[PDB]
Enzyme design. Structure first.
Site, PDB file in Angstrom:
ATOM      1  N   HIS A 199      -7.101 -13.979   3.512  1.00  0.00           N
ATOM      2  CA  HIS A 199      -6.493 -12.816   2.880  1.00  0.00           C
ATOM      3  C   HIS A 199      -5.531 -13.243   1.773  1.00  0.00           C
ATOM      4  CE1 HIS A 199      -4.914  -8.870   2.251  1.00  0.00           C
ATOM      5  NE2 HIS A 199      -3.768  -9.087   2.874  1.00  0.00           N
ATOM      6  N   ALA A 208       8.371  -9.042   3.693  1.00  0.00           N
ATOM      7  CA  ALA A 208       7.200  -9.089   4.566  1.00  0.00           C
ATOM      8  C   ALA A 208       6.118  -8.131   4.086  1.00  0.00           C
ATOM      9  CB  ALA A 208       7.599  -8.765   6.007  1.00  0.00           C
ATOM     10  N   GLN A 265      -6.776  -4.941   0.272  1.00  0.00           N
ATOM     11  CA  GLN A 265      -5.416  -4.827   0.776  1.00  0.00           C
ATOM     12  C   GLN A 265      -5.393  -3.946   2.020  1.00  0.00           C
ATOM     13  OE1 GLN A 265      -4.252  -7.270  -1.026  1.00  0.00           O
ATOM     14  NE2 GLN A 265      -2.654  -6.344  -2.301  1.00  0.00           N
ATOM     15  N   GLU A 324       1.949  -5.866 -15.897  1.00  0.00           N
ATOM     16  CA  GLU A 324       1.638  -6.339 -14.557  1.00  0.00           C
ATOM     17  C   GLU A 324       2.050  -7.801 -14.387  1.00  0.00           C
ATOM     18  OE1 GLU A 324       0.560  -3.874 -11.358  1.00  0.00           O
ATOM     19  OE2 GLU A 324       0.948  -6.026 -11.585  1.00  0.00           O
TER      20      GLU A 324
HETATM   21  C1  LIG Z   1       7.192  -6.228  -6.474  1.00  0.00           C
HETATM   22  C2  LIG Z   1       5.792  -6.340  -5.935  1.00  0.00           C
HETATM   23  C3  LIG Z   1       4.873  -5.393  -6.348  1.00  0.00           C
HETATM   24  C4  LIG Z   1       3.568  -5.424  -5.890  1.00  0.00           C
HETATM   25  N1  LIG Z   1       2.694  -4.456  -6.335  1.00  0.00           N
HETATM   26  C5  LIG Z   1       1.391  -4.459  -5.901  1.00  0.00           C
HETATM   27  C6  LIG Z   1       0.512  -3.484  -6.351  1.00  0.00           C
HETATM   28  O1  LIG Z   1       0.892  -2.620  -7.139  1.00  0.00           O
HETATM   29  N2  LIG Z   1      -0.795  -3.493  -5.911  1.00  0.00           N
HETATM   30  C7  LIG Z   1      -1.223  -4.464  -5.023  1.00  0.00           C
HETATM   31  O2  LIG Z   1      -2.390  -4.464  -4.632  1.00  0.00           O
HETATM   32  N3  LIG Z   1      -0.348  -5.433  -4.574  1.00  0.00           N
HETATM   33  C8  LIG Z   1       0.962  -5.435  -5.012  1.00  0.00           C
HETATM   34  N4  LIG Z   1       1.843  -6.400  -4.563  1.00  0.00           N
HETATM   35  C9  LIG Z   1       1.330  -7.442  -3.617  1.00  0.00           C
HETATM   36  C10 LIG Z   1       1.274  -6.943  -2.187  1.00  0.00           C
HETATM   37  O3  LIG Z   1       2.528  -6.409  -1.836  1.00  0.00           O
HETATM   38  C11 LIG Z   1       0.882  -8.133  -1.317  1.00  0.00           C
HETATM   39  O4  LIG Z   1      -0.417  -8.600  -1.623  1.00  0.00           O
HETATM   40  C12 LIG Z   1       0.970  -7.698   0.135  1.00  0.00           C
HETATM   41  O5  LIG Z   1       0.496  -8.762   0.934  1.00  0.00           O
HETATM   42  C13 LIG Z   1       0.171  -6.444   0.463  1.00  0.00           C
HETATM   43  O6  LIG Z   1       0.374  -6.216   1.837  1.00  0.00           O
HETATM   44  P1  LIG Z   1      -0.895  -6.260   2.827  1.00  0.00           P
HETATM   45  O7  LIG Z   1      -1.284  -7.707   3.016  1.00  0.00           O
HETATM   46  O8  LIG Z   1      -0.525  -5.611   4.142  1.00  0.00           O
HETATM   47  O9  LIG Z   1      -2.039  -5.519   2.174  1.00  0.00           O
HETATM   48  C14 LIG Z   1       3.158  -6.408  -5.001  1.00  0.00           C
HETATM   49  C15 LIG Z   1       4.086  -7.365  -4.572  1.00  0.00           C
HETATM   50  C16 LIG Z   1       5.406  -7.322  -5.030  1.00  0.00           C
HETATM   51  C17 LIG Z   1       6.395  -8.350  -4.587  1.00  0.00           C
HETATM   52 NA    NA Z   2       2.260  -7.054   3.904  1.00  0.00          NA
END
Ligand SMILES: Cc1cc2nc3c(=O)[nH]c(=O)nc-3n(C[C@H](O)[C@H](O)[C@H](O)COP(=O)(O)O)c2cc1C
Ligand code: NA
Ligand SMILES: Cc1cc2nc3c(=O)[nH]c(=O)nc-3n(C[C@H](O)[C@H](O)[C@H](O)COP(=O)(O)O)c2cc1C
Ligand SMILES: [Mn+2]
Ligand SMILES: [Mn+2]
Ligand code: NA
Lengths: 499, 496
Positions: free
Chosen positions: A389, A221, A190, A281
């Protein structure tokens, strides 16, 4: 129509708009943030009830509120996705395809940089250093067997690459450790984990902030797997057609949305950790044992008057890990596939599958020209999708012709049951690395780091030659167009009316 | 309501009293239009249409579409199916299965032979037989012919008279007094008819259309060989089914049937039958030669109601009736074999192409086995039964989920099936020939389509579970669940 567009950029207005739609229940009864809020909201998801706005939470800062199910589904099937659609200012009858199409148009539009302001509502209250007491907020214990109370379940981290090129907004959970420390995962794939690892090679901790009750479009987003290096804030502006108004944090220079409900600021420690989790989760399960996670130090926090803390009570679908995350993954995967030349016209992470599979809709009038077969196609799709990704997050891919609507689980099930041949259509990819949260992984998969990936092929073999063994026996496909219109024309006159 | 189980005409009137019937007085074309309306009725889960004004049709004759379709109102979704068994409108799959299984345990109640009945109000003999005077529909655009029988059952009898078999099978219209339909050798009609080919004479036959709904349901049920359907119906409803003799061949049909056809199945005359949209949701392009059914006489009630089923994508009667009957028979087969199964359900969404087995997790450990061995054991028992032969795919899942809810089955398939360990093909077990995904290799070998998908985590075979379910029911103590339910209205939801 004006209220809807302001909903995308203003959480507080979003909540007022939900009420105007009849999609909000104002809970005036006193509720316990110890499990009760979590239980009510879980039942809201599963009954697809209106979102609860909790006005009175025991032992909490006076005036503090909690919003449950900010993107849950509605029972009314014609408006089932309206709460999710309102995150982007879309009308109540918008469906998956409408949402994905708009998310993709924003991808090709030039980013609109955020507008820097001097003041904003998020600064109406500021707690500095020793004033920081996270336990004053209505921090919920979300599930009975959870390892701790979670402050952040519906906010996004804000961090910045040391060189100032990449502004990352990403949603990730943050557990409450004490009055000014949180702990949460930073999976290395991430974007927070990558930028955090950019700071460890500089001998410094990562400056960090979290926005809670942020502009709904900005939160969506942040839950979207946009490619590496792409700034979420510019994508939000392009999505809504105007800059996101931002202000500087009080103590570390990061820019956060100006009308956020609650802003936390501090830094991510380099090696301090705390046992974090477990937590119910997105896959629907509560695993028994937690894991050490980095500590987030909160040096300051600010919030609007009577702040609204949105929450997500993760578990069996549909909640925001499916309505937001899955939706965002679906749109990113569609863009990934089409950009790679794959003959895919829609992708959908079935909510019922708990964001553990993606159904790819295959344009059948493009398949023949590839001169391929199920085994070769499945491998090509696997490398393309799982290497992205967005595709890394999803372990199972179902390939089916675009004669079915892949957003309808009943049609997907029909295709799985009737088209997947047991001997020929089950393509495991045990060498592709796994997303570590997949619930069916065994000790062996976790030692190798792979073994969970799968492509299920629902394309009949003749379809790779542009043929089909049989027509579909349905109203749409078993009767001539002129007869279908006559039936649709006279439906009410036959005696049926609306049914 | 129990009247409805034993009287098709009362059943129709009962549907109207429930608000579950639309009386179509607009003139409709039995050429495709009736089929198109009814197909949309299935897919929109609309009330059952009763067509009163059928162009080019025998005066007074009516057509009932979707006799066992589902309803949009989720609380009464299975009411029309349940009413086949006299069950109330809120009855669901499990209530229906439980009652069908209790009927297996009761001894049969033989039919009460009467000498007169409503089905005899009109009689056509020999040259009077004109099947084309009835509103025989063309059900699908590419269908190979018009189908007179889509919702009736064949009546035949062993030469010994020990076995009275009632089985539902399709019958295409060939000409004014001849029909043609399949008699697959594993079905009981094909077995009794081929007992007659060893005798010098053809098979005496009758078909009841608009029969007592409870009788139709049983005829659509794969009860064991030699088991008479009529006696099982009496045990199901608690009283004998009233039947009269045919006018010309001594076979006995229910007395208040809407329409009864009589004749014999020829030994070797055939006609190109099909194709027809079928239960699996597809219309394959080419038909097959099938035995000819000669109609020497027919009888019908005044203003007869011809029920039809427009096969295709679910849910229609090949799923709501057939699938339901299979599921209950499969539960009995499994439990009789000692398998730790507490429910079986052929998800309507899967077009009667898979069966979901709910595994009693508290009995699994005592078996001392594992997924591979259990799957093989389930495959042998289930696929070897008359009912289990009809279904090519089995899903084994723990009984923590409700296997009647497709959303929960999907959650389990997606989150519990491991790609490397839980896909158990059985290419040597003989296939049901209608399975739509079979290839040329399977149809020449006679097998290759059977599958067991395992959704039991490996630790469950030791009586364990890696993680609890994060849901309202399973993530909160009973006292809190009760309090939320009690105070739901105080919170402001009011029935939300
Ligand atoms: C409500 C919600 C909770 C989330 N919680 C997590 C989390 O705890 N850990 C995680 O890795 N991704 C979590 N996600 C998924 C990330 O937000 C998602 O993969 C996102 O693309 C991460 O941003 P990035 O691509 O900039 O890393 C969650 C998504 C939502 C909608
Ligand atoms: Na994001
Ligand atoms: C509406 C409906 C139509 C059916 N049509 C056929 C058919 O055309 N051919 C067939 O082999 N089975 C058909 N079936 C399945 C049989 O009715 C079912 O397998 C039944 O158990 C056969 O009776 P038996 O056990 O005496 O062989 C149908 C079932 C229903 C509910
Ligand atoms: Mn990112
Ligand atoms: Mn039988
Ligand atoms: Na039968």
């Amino acid at each position: 129509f004006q209220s809807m567009n302001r909903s995308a950029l203003d959480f507080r207005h979003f909540v007022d708009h939900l009420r105007r739609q009849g999609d909000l229940v104002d809970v005036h009864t006193e509720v316990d943030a110890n499990l009760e809020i979590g239980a009510i909201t879980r039942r809201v998801y599963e009954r697809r009830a209106p979102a609860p706005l909790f006005h009175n939470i025991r032992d909490s800062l006076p005036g503090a509120r909690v919003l449950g199910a900010p993107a849950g589904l509605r029972a009314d099937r014609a408006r089932a996705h309206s709460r999710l659609a309102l995150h982007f200012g879309l009308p109540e009858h918008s469906g998956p395809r409408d949402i994905v199409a708009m998310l993709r148009a924003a991808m090709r539009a030039e980013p609109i940089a955020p507008r820097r302001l001097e003041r904003g509502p998020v600064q109406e209250n500021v707690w500095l250093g020793e004033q920081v007491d996270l336990t004053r907020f209505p921090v919920p214990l979300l599930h009975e067997q959870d390892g701790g109370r979670y402050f952040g379940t519906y906010g996004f981290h804000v961090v910045q690459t040391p060189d100032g090129s990449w502004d990352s907004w990403s949603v990730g959970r943050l557990m409450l450790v004490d009055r000014n420390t949180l702990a949460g995962p930073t999976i290395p794939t991430q974007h927070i984990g990558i930028i955090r690892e950019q700071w460890r090679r500089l001998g410094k901790p990562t400056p960090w902030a979290m926005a809670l009750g942020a502009p709904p479009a900005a939160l969506a987003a942040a839950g979207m797997p946009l490619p590496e290096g792409v700034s979420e804030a510019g994508y939000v502006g392009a999505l809504v057609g105007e800059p996101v108004e931002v202000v500087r944090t009080q103590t570390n220079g990061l820019w956060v949305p100006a009308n956020t409900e609650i802003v936390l600021e501090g830094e991510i420690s380099l090696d301090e950790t705390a046992l974090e989790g477990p937590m119910g989760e997105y896959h629907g399960y509560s695993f028994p044992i937690g894991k050490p996670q980095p500590l987030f130090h909160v040096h300051a926090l600010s919030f609007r008057d009577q702040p609204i803390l949105p929450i997500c009570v993760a578990g069996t679908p549909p909640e925001e890990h499916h309505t937001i995350w899955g939706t965002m993954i679906s749109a990113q995967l569609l863009d990934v596939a089409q950009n790679a030349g794959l003959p895919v016209d829609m992708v959908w992470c079935s909510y019922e599958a708990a964001t553990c599979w993606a159904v790819l809709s295959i344009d059948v009038q493009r398949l023949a020209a590839l001169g391929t077969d199920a085994a070769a196609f499945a491998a090509r799709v696997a490398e393309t999708v799982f290497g992205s990704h967005a595709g890394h997050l999803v372990p199972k891919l179902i390939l089916v012709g675009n004669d079915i609507d892949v957003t309808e689980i009943d049609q997907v099930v029909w295709a799985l049951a009737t088209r997947a041949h047991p001997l020929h259509d089950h393509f495991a990819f045990p060498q592709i690395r796994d997303f570590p949260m997949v619930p069916y992984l065994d000790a062996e998969d976790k030692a190798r780091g792979s073994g969970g990936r799968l492509v299920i092929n629902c394309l009949y073999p003749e379809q790779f030659a542009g043929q089909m063994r049989a027509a579909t026996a349905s109203f749409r496909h078993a009767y001539p167009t002129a007869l279908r219109r006559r039936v649709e024309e006279r439906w009410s006159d036959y005696g049926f009316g609306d049914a």
